[PDB]
Structure 1
Amino acid sequence: MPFAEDKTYKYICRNFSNFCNVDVVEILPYLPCLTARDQDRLRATCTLSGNRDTLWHLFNTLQRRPGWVEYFIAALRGCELVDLADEVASVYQSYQP
C-alpha cells in the first residue's frame, strides 16, 4: 500500500495513545460516507461492549472508502478537537509528493 492516504492509516495504528479521546457516537452523524449497515453495527457494539472497544472498528471501517481523510479532519474540527485535526493534516501532507 504505497499510497499517501493508506499510509496515513498506519500512522493511527502506531500512535493510538493520542486517538483514544475520539467519541464514536457523537462523530458518527458527521461522517456521511458510512453506509446504513456500517453505521448501524457500530452503535450495537457500543451498547454491548464499552466505548474504546469500538474505536478499532470505527477506524478500520473508515479507511475502506477513499477520500476519508478529508471527512475525518472536518469532523474533528467541528467537534472541538482542533489540536488532533491539525496533527492529522500535517501527516497527510508529509506523504503526498
Structure 2
Amino acid sequence: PHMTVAEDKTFQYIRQHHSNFSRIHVLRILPYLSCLTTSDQDRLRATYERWGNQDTLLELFTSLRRRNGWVHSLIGALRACELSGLADEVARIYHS
C-alpha cells in the first residue's frame, strides 16, 4: 500500500509529458537519486550503455516508481543537474 495518490499522479504526468523530460542525461542524474539501490544504479548504468539515453530514461522512471520517496529524490536530483524547471513542474503536480 506504499504508492500514494500523489506519487501515481506524478508518475502519470511524467508519462504523458515524457518529451518535456528528454534533456535529462541519465548518467549524470543517477548518482543523485538516493532512492535507488546500488544494484539499481549498477543495472541502470549497464542499461544506458546498451540502449542509450532515451530508452534508459523510460526504464529509469519505472525503476524510480518502485522505490520509496522517488518523487522527492527526483526533484532534488533535477535541481542538482541544472534542470530546476523540471523540478518545479514535478513538485507542482505532486502537490496538486
TM-score normalised over the length of structure 1 = 0.88
Q: What is the percent sequence identity of the aligned residues?
A: 60
Q: Distance in 1 between matches of 2:72 and 2:52?
A: 27
Q: Distance in 2 between matches of 1:2 and 1:50?
A: 30
Q: Which runs of 5+ in 1 are unaligned?
A: none
RMSD: 1.4
Q: Matched residue pairs, number?
A: 94
Deviations 1:15-64 (A, max 9, x none): 11101111110111111221122111111111112211101110000011
Name whichever structure is richer in helix by fraction.
2
> 1:2: how far off?
6.7
SS across alignment from 2:52: coil
Q: Which runs of 5+ in 2 are unaligned?
A: none
Letter in 2 for 1:63: R
Flag as ranges the 4+ runs of structure 1 deviating above 6 A.
none
> 1:86: how far off?
0.9
